[PDB]
Amino acid sequence: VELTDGFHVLIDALKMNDIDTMYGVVGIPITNLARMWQDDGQRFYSFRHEQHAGYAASIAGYIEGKPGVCLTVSAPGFLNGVTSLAHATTNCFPMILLSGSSEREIVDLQQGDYEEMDQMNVARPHCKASFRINSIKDIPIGIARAVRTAVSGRPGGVYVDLPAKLFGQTISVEEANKLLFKPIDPAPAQIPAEDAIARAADLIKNAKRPVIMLGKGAAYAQCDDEIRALVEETGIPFLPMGMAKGLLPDNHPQSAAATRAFALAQCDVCVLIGARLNWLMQHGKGKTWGDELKKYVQIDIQANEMDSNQPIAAPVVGDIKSAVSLLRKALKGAPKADAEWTGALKAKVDGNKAKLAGKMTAETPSGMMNYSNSLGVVRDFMLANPDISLVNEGANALDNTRMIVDMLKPRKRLDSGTWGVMGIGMGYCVAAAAVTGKPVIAVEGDSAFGFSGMELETICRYNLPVTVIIMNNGGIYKGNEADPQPGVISCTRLTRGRYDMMMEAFGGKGYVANTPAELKAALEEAVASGKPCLINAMIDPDAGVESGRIKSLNVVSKV
Amino acid sequence: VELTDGFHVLIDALKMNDIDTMYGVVGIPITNLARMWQDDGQRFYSFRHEQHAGYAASIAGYIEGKPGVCLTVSAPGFLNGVTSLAHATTNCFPMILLSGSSEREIVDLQQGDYEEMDQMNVARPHCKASFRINSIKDIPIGIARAVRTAVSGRPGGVYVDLPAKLFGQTISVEEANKLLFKPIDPAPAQIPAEDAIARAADLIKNAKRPVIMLGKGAAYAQCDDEIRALVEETGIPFLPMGMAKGLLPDNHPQSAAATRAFALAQCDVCVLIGARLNWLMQHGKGKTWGDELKKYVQIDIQANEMDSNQPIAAPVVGDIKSAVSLLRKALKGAPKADAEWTGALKAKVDGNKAKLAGKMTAETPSGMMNYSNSLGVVRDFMLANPDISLVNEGANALDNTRMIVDMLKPRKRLDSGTWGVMGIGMGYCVAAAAVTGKPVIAVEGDSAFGFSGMELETICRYNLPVTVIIMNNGGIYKGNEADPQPGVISCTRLTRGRYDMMMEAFGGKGYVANTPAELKAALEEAVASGKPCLINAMIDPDAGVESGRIKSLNVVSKV
Amino acid sequence: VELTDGFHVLIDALKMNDIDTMYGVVGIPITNLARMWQDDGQRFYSFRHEQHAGYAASIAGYIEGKPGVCLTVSAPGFLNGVTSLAHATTNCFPMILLSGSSEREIVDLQQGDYEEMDQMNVARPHCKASFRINSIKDIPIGIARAVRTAVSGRPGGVYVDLPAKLFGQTISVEEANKLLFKPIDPAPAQIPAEDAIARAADLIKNAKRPVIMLGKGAAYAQCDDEIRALVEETGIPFLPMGMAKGLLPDNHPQSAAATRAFALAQCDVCVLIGARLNWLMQHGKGKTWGDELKKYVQIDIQANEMDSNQPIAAPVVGDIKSAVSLLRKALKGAPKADAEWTGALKAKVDGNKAKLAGKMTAETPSGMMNYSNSLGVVRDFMLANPDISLVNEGANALDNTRMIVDMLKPRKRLDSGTWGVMGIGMGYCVAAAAVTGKPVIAVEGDSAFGFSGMELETICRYNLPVTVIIMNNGGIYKGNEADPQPGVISCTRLTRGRYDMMMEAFGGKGYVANTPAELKAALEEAVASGKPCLINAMIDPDAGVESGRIKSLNVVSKV
Ligand SMILES: Nc1ncnc2c1ncn2[C@@H]1O[C@H](COP(=O)(O)OP(=O)(O)O)[C@@H](O)[C@H]1O
Ligand SMILES: Nc1ncnc2c1ncn2[C@@H]1O[C@H](COP(=O)(O)OP(=O)(O)O)[C@@H](O)[C@H]1O
Ligand SMILES: Nc1ncnc2c1ncn2[C@@H]1O[C@H](COP(=O)(O)OP(=O)(O)O)[C@@H](O)[C@H]1O
Ligand SMILES: [Mg+2]
Ligand SMILES: [Mg+2]
Ligand SMILES: [Mg+2]
């Protein structure tokens, strides 16, 4: 009777759930899992730190709608991975963290095992569910549980603990075949009732000044034409959140993105589609919303997200594709939004965009670009080459890129997200390249970059078509903060370094860009090369402001 | 400008969410909340221990489909309540535990505050969500969050922490009335996709030996007529779980309850409606399922419950009412289940019921009734008086009542549930009496009763129409286990006590029943009286078996 | 080769660590552990609820200085026990909760096992350490870890998870003998440095108005003569906390207990011996301490208890026996405290005691005793019969007993403790009787009693020499709060019940006491009988005040 083992049953179960890629870092007790995964013909991306393998997994989940899978070792490796899992869960990205763990007997008596930790218990605050697979016979069910939990309801992170003793267990191939199975419909549709839709429809029809807010939940849903149809049929102005950019093209005539403050302050009805009324929307409170309670329509798969911050006048619970489809039919043939309202917003958008144009054409000294004339080059490039992932993080580097760089296609913009995480950059690049097979451009604050910068080597090792643009202003927000004391560097300063040389250290191509012309030539060559590149963009140390757009959130001393 | 305070804003927010009843125990810092609730005209039931207030709240939730509300003090009182909250979440019963807590400054520095505990964080494993309301202005949103979390998705427990400093905060009546609101549609319908229903219809139409399993989730859904219609139109034999008894009348001709072992072992398609494939169903594994994987159809609102134990061939995710309605329509005109299958089960049920009838007719010596002839009296009574809640817990006292006492009406049988909790009895009695305004009968094992027995005084104090039957066999399972050493009583023995005298001690009516005839007269009189009664049923100490029906789950020494 | 099993190895390991008694409730999967424990000749006390078995265990730990052991079943049973474990840890009482748990495979995949819970993880906030013993071979080490953690450092609770699969494992007797071992010195002495003692000595010598505060840590230490020698040699006035009463006799001439407010407010140096500067001492802040920072000496085994609330001028870290012994030698021959100070306090003590005498002699109508003339009888009895445990809980019933009933012997008074827990009463009685072999008297508020009252049956079943005095005032604080609405009883009301009849229901002796004379005759007969008794003491419903001595801690509405 022929036998197989835990290693192979796990490999088979993952494949049966349509996993063909893992992101991780090897070591005891999972090195041979990664090896045999590769031997079987599957993809393993080895990173320089598990956190970045984890961030890769998180965004693979977002882009594909199936869980990104991260593989780590026990205690120290797991901890690094779980920080990323926490980020996945916060952002509603489907992800499975797989980690090796040590001996149950020793760990449970806290005796000081190799990399000792109750990883299953430690994971709980950071994921939807934390499981452990103890027996070879339970591998298929365990992986099914993990996948379903990751992709159903509000998508998010799942931890699966894999004790070292699992892998060496054996079972007959006959019995293994009998246990292996593919879950049916792991991310089911959830359809709202007619009266929930009708309530929303009535609110929208009676609105004088409606807006639609598209969140990354709407982008994640992959029902791009449904959402575009709703916007265009209703004639309602829309606003995208950071990663909802490109769901409809950012240059769509009904976009009110360039007059956000006025749009939100003056609207009466606001339709939230896969977007939380959280800190990014000032909790539906304060001067952002004209110091009044708006009439909110909200479409969300998570029932208890309703009334989290402000009373929701028309809650619609279900998956966005089902709900928007029904809402469209409910609104069939209804009058479009008032031309006075939409025309007023468009006039402001045109005016503000004209002002931005002026800023982007401004001339600066060599090696002293500002955020407008530098990012203006990236804007033009992305308008001409929209089928490219745009990774973005920083303060000024984040906010100005969100403003300036129009996305024409969905799920291309990948940024710091709900927790405003610095560190997602290089991991996001690896996963974006891996899952799309297309180029990636990253616009990185120089501080932001340092959180994941060593993964430049990972990007070179896999010869990925990634161009990293460092917005090198020489520090956090600014690069010119004075020494607080004699010979003492300010805490916000960074070396205005040759990141180009660091890229070249690992076989990539480096550029220095001192002017917009040089940045343009570098970017065009870099993307065309299809090879790993870094462009060191020399930004004026005085160009940025404190915390970018969220300056007012800082706590300052008054004594 | 007229002011109000946290006490009143909280009272009003609870009322806006249709809460008119709390179960609790008073003390610092919440006595005056309870007082003002009563002063306002709402109901407060004071118990002798918070655990029983908590169990009361949990079953109020099950019966009504709105969260039962428990009020406790800080640390020691909170802990008692949170054990019941854990039970509620485990059983999918909607419940809100409200507890006072101490000073944030002192507790957060672990300095030894009055009843010091981080109750919010301690609650987390035992509920769907644990919240704290710090500001008077957030009371309406906080309660909305709690109610929505309790009743939406899979219903369950929610903890709401109320720091002592909340209640004395003040606000204008004008501003408070602006903040107060009623959540729209807190427990929304969730409708499954057409293909999910079609997959279920296909399996049912091709089944040779189908069964339908009804769980307490089906009962909770309150679509009794729809479920009965599905059963009757398909002609499929059905089996109720413990608290699904009465969803369809237990004497319905399609019930296979009296031939459960054969039905489950021999079936091909099994339709799980609001019932988990957990320990109560032996995880869909082993001898009880003929050592094979059945074709499971499952209807559940919790997406990731699918494939928790065995592969589910037709997962139907959504609320049971919506799903059953669609499934019915998907099966319209299909032939009824095979007559040789349904005929075979009916013959077995008829034979088994005949054997049980023989047992219930058995004659026993005075003071030495067995479980059949004693519970046969309760059976006849409940058939003549079906509009009464039947509370039940114990081992033999539980299993034999579930078998013998037929329920004709839904949501009347209230038992130990998913964790097989001893302790639910008297709390369940108070809540059932309070929410139904009708009589309650409790069939209690004598050990079972001791977990909540002090609450007889609560039952007497509120003059509730509750008749408690103590199955007094003098111990756990049996009352005759030999002294393990000379002069040393066995750990399983209990005093064969005068529980009637204990009831009389608090103004209740006490009876001793030594024969079925005495039990019958006592029960009829007690229920008819409309007063709090206890019947001390004298059961043969040798009548029961080890752990009743779950004898085989015991761990025994073989050395 | 002869074999033994998990059951027997565990029994042997417990005995080797000097455990001969467990308190618990049986059921799957531990019934046969309890049975075989009894078969071996050890004591098992079966309760009616695990919480009270747990409270028993906690106080057995306090009285004996070795961990009280509580045994429960999985999930629901464990939860009940862990509430008591949390109380043990809060009070620094050594305790081990042993609980059965279910199948690792099933529980770890959250599949719905019998009584499913990660009990090990759930216990963590409530104990010093939470362990699980997976393998038969690790039982001796596991029990050693539990005992050491329970009794060393700051004593407290420990949870040991015992999966069902442990008990049936086998091992050769030869190998079992080799693994069994007794831990060496599980509660070691910890001796402070000379300079720590010298600092304290200097502070004490230079004090003008010193006081010594004795906490229950000092009582727990069992170095009664060391502490008495320190007090008498220094001539410093002392004050006992609630359970430190009797460490020195409460009628000792240097006791300042009867002038506490003045003593604490006017002292300059305060010596804390096994007593935390927590809420019981108003955190060393406010008018209790004359609104100033005192010069604190503190002796405690827990280093980081120092500076928890107020700066400690002379921290002495180590075990109380070692520290007090060294301090005595450091103070050898030093002048006694100023006679002006000690004489001033004694004059106030005599005056206040004379006033109390007047109250205790006061005459009241039959069935309307107050707290002074009723508890005056208990005072006289305990002065004449000091070798009796005095259990005490309630509000007015607690505070007035602490004031009125002088303890002459150490570790006899057992009360609500650090969390002011209602519920410790009947469990405390069982353990006190079990470990002392001497009588127990309980003074119980009627509300307090209801939290554990069913355990009267447990007290009768084991024929324990326990006399329960119910301070029956008919409610919480008072028994006469008006109906808030027509026909609606106030939340603070309780049935003024015949608790005497409840005692007699289970074979105990009941008394009703309407006057001090009747209370005295009843108490003398009850204690002399050596049998289980309850005295139902009829207290004036209007005698008590809101929350007793902590009235000012209540939160009251001002609108
Ligand atoms: N397929 C889906 N259908 C409906 N709602 C979804 C779906 N996927 C995610 N969501 C919801 O989308 C929301 C995402 O909000 P958020 O991350 O705050 O977006 P943003 O940051 O763009 O505003 C979450 O509330 C989540 O429950
Ligand atoms: N309204 C509802 N619609 C669909 N499923 C529900 C609803 N309410 C509860 N449920 C589900 O019902 C199930 C109850 O199962 P369980 O408590 O195991 O029942 P039983 O013990 O009777 O078999 C849970 O899985 C829960 O998610
Ligand atoms: N043997 C011992 N030696 C020194 N300190 C001890 C010993 N046993 C317990 N303690 C300490 O005694 C203190 C007990 O304080 P607490 O419970 O607040 O007493 P009280 O409530 O009587 O004031 C704890 O800080 C604990 O660390
Ligand atoms: Mg920078
Ligand atoms: Mg019994
Ligand atoms: Mg009282």
Swiss-Prot record, chains A, B, C:
Signal peptide (UniProt feature, chain positions): none
Biochemical pathway:
Metabolic intermediate degradation; oxalate degradation; CO(2) and formate from oxalate: step 2/2
Impact of altering residue 115 to Q?
A: Slight increase of the affinity binding and strong reduction in the catalytic efficiency for oxalyl-CoA
Q: What is its EC number?
A: 4.1.1.8
Reported impact of residue 547 to A: Does not affect oxalyl-CoA binding, but it reduces 7-fold the catalytic efficiency for oxalyl-CoA
Q: So where does this one cross the membrane?
A: none
Cofactor(s), by name? a metal cation; thiamine diphosphate
UniProt effect for mutating residue 477 to F: 2-fold reduction in the affinity binding and strong reduction in the catalytic efficiency for oxalyl-CoA
What does the cofactor field's note say?
Binds 1 metal ion per subunit. Binds 1 thiamine pyrophosphate per subunit.
What InterPro entries has UniProt attached to this entry? DHS-like_NAD/FAD-binding_dom (IPR029035), HACL1-like (IPR045025), Oxalyl-CoA_decarboxylase (IPR017660), THDP-binding (IPR029061), Thiamin_PyroP_enz_cen_dom (IPR012000), Thiamin_PyroP_enz_TPP-bd_dom (IPR012001), TPP_enzyme_TPP-bd (IPR011766)
- Please give one Gene Ontology molecular function term for this protein: magnesium ion binding
EC main class here is: lyase
Disulfide feature = none
Q: Where does substrate bind?
A: 28, 114, 257-261, 352, 402-403, 547-549
Post-translationally, this protein is described as follows, namely: The N-terminus is blocked.
**Annotated Pfam families:** TPP_enzyme_C, TPP_enzyme_M, TPP_enzyme_N
Q: For binding Mg(2+), which residues are annotated in this chain's numbering? A: 446, 473, 475
Binding of ADP, residues: 154, 216, 276, 300, 320
Please state how the activity of this protein is regulated: Inhibited by CoA and activated by ADP.
UniProt KW keywords: Decarboxylase, Lyase, Magnesium, Metal-binding, Nucleotide-binding, Thiamine pyrophosphate
How this chain assembles, per its entry, is:
Homotetramer; dimer of dimers.
- Protein family: Belongs to the TPP enzyme family.
Query: What is this protein called in UniProt?
Result: Oxalyl-CoA decarboxylase
The gene designation is oxc
